[PDB]
Amino acid sequence: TPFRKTMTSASVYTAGLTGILGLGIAAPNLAFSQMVTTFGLAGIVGYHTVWG
Amino acid sequence: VKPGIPYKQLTVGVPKEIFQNEKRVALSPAGVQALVKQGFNVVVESGAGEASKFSDDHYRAAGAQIQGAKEVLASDLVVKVRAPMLNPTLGIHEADLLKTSGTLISFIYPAQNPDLLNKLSKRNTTVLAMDQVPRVTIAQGYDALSSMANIAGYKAVVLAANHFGRFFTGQITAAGKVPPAKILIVGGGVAGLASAGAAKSMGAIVRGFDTRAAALEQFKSLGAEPLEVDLKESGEGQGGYAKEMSKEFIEAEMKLFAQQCKEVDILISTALIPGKKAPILFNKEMIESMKEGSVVVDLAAEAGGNFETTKPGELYVHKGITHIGYTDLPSRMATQASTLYSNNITKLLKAISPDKDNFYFEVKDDFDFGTMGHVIRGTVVMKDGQVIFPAPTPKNIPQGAPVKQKTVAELEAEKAATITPFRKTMTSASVYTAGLTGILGLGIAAPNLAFSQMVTTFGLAGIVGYHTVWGVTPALHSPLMSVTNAISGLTAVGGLVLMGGHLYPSTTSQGLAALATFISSVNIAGGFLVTQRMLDMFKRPTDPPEYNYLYLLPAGTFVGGYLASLYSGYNIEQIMYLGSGLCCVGALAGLSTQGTARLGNALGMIGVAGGLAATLGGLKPCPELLAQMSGAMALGGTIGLTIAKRIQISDLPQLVAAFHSLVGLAAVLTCIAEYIIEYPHFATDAAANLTKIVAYLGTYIGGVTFSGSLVAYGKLQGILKSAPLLLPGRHLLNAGLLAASVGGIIPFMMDPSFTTGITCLGSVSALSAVMGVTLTAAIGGADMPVVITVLNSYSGWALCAEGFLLNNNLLTIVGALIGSSGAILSYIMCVAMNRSLANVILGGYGTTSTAGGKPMEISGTHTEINLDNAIDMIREANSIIITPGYGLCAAKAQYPIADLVKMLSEQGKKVRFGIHPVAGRMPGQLNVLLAEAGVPYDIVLEMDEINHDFPDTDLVLVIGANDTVNSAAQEDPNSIIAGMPVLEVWKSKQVIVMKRSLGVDNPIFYKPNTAMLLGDAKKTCDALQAKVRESYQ
């Protein structure tokens, strides 16, 4: 049914956003936050460039 | 008075043909509407049309007055198919039954009718020889022998059947496979091309060859097998016709024909030299050298024949060979023959005296190659009985020397051949050494760790933003810049950071960084409201309802989890900036398949809410100024929400320009605010000697993009002139302003006084605004959709500069995304129109493919029809493709098209839309204007997927589009638009154009298949839907 498509998609996004906050809670310093940011952005570049 | 008697005093005469074995007619009933439309009277014979199966009742109803026999010849304009001969039913020569000093127009050929010429000179009449029309470029409307040859070739290819023994198509049947038959064509002209096209339609194999190499090449381009004999004799003579060859090439072709005579099953001989006897191209035993059941067609029957045995008046089975020697192929298909004769006579009578009613038919002797006076001299040989029979020579003619006309797409392959691979890889590696020394230069001036970290997060955000903006579907570019103007309201984040005081502003730093928040808060609410309005029009009513309220489940848990998480005693700001940056990327990655469009708006709202909440919690405000932040944000959002639900969609680029101008003002109001607030810290710091260079750069970019988008708004609303303003030299001025801008950085260095910085910041904001007004004014009116995207880019790069300024990590990601999106949207249309960006900003002329001067001119004649036949023309078409322009939507006429399209689609038709990407004044601005009226998304196709079924398309309508359906972009290397990839709308069967007048010029107007409806566009389109609605129930 068209309810469960959006429900599953919204469940995936709320799991991802609470995982981002969970990585935020255990952060000891700003160096780890910097490495998480450059890690995520390099991951999206890597996802996007090897379909090419 | 005009030099000639008008057509109302001009009666015409079409008498009965008295010759034997001639079924042709002079003019049909459809031919009687024309030339009565010219004004000439119509007098008809008794029963001539019934021989060609035409009713004399319909002939008299067409506007004619049927008369006798001698009374049909004694008019002011006598016309027949054959020449004036002696009638056996009533004994008289036909010149005596005609009026003295009358008009005669028929196939005469006085080279073979010299005694008939002496008879026609006796009555002192005027002769108009139809067959004597020379091969001119304007002679496509009058060529009697060409149409007669096409009719004879169609009749002969039909007469292949009911003479052969087996089928010529061929199939793979269940009882066994059937092989096709090979057909021979001897004599390559229009007749050979027509027989080859009809045989290939019938599914035959052709192996015809000709003496003229252009004839064999055109036959091979039609798909025939142009054979080649081993004889070095030139087939062409002085022009396109054949010439006299020796017996050596004749014997070589005779041996090849005897070899191929036992190869093919069908043989058609159409070879003949005009004025002399046709050469016998078939021998006595080589003709019997085929199988028992052969078919030998001799289409040179009146001029002898191309066989050693051919009786020219009867058919015969010659020892197992069909001797198709019928003397009158033109008497076999006389209906379409008379139709073509009437059409050619209509073009001839239109050309002979093109006035309203003058009947001039002037006599010119010194006449040019291609001149209609030369055609008049060649056509009229007996002028009032007097002999102008000796035809004059043509004027100075190269006679079609550049027959390989310079088509456009090949000169770029010639230009990309001096791009020899050494200099190609040299200019490849030069780019990478420039880039690597650039990043080394940024490494040299790096003050600390945080600047290098900011460079890395900016660079990887740039590569994400480059790869994801090509990912959007090209039918949703109009939500794209609305959602990037929505996300660019995150310079409120950099406004809130240095906001403070109490419920009132106290200082002037805090005074500037409160209306920074106020003017930026319009952007968030306005952009997301207008994006949500635009994505509720692409949704079909048949689409199952996506429950969009369920996306509050991530958003509330995200923001409230940050709220509980800083209530618990943490600091989750530097990861919340990552979360908002990834939700802002997912906003633009959402709208990429037309079905996940609402995901890519909700994620943007989640990201902007997360970014605002993070920068709010990361300052820990007292409740006295938290009231100020809430009041400023709410007073921004109320105006931003109340001017986004009021606008009508077709006025979108105005608020797009306004929302760039507000971001451009917000960046300059937040750069000098931190330069004021960071002044007593420049002594004991290291990065402080480049927060100055970042502030200067950001103020420059913001001051440009403020005023440039103001000028673009004033030019879109009609208030400023739609003409470019170019009084001064304009390049010393812009170079002087740019040199002052780049030179202003050293007085802003070199002395640390509090006044000398701020006066230089004011100076660079002032001269940058004047630079923006100077550049953006002298742009144009059709080059408008460039500056929207370029101003979008400068807004994004201003956000990124301010992000370097505050060392905030969300702003570089968001700004690099918006700036890369603006750059990609400028590049897509600067390849759509084939110009450059410096060829538009600097007011340049032409394009990237225009050569030198002399734009070659149009010729050919146009055709207009009224409303009642056009709609019945619609009613017998299966597939329709409509190609709108901006003039459709600017006249509010997209609504009555939206009913026409559905009522045609509900009867089995194939109505679709072609869209050129520079139609509206914004990227994809007319997809939304079609989707408002009620067209679905799935039948609106872009250019690159509809430009290959215009061959397989019956009717092509054109509404208002004048610049994107030209063929000067394909066939002229001198015009302005050469190289611009346009729709190939001339590849079809019939074209309609809805335009208010007649004639900056496009040669799709001058084609055999093009109409022109006249009138107001709305007043035409509602008449179209009215006729459909009252003609289909």
Next chain:
Amino acid sequence: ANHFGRFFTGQITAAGKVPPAKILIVGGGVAGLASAGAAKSMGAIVRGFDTR
């Protein structure tokens, strides 16, 4: 052909548009499909129909 006085296919050249013909295939068995293939190869507009 040799019964119809008009061209079967018809072209729009620069001398006048030749309208294509309309052929009625009354009754389609096997010969209906065969003659329809022969006409569609010839270039006519066929509008045959049958009870089956």
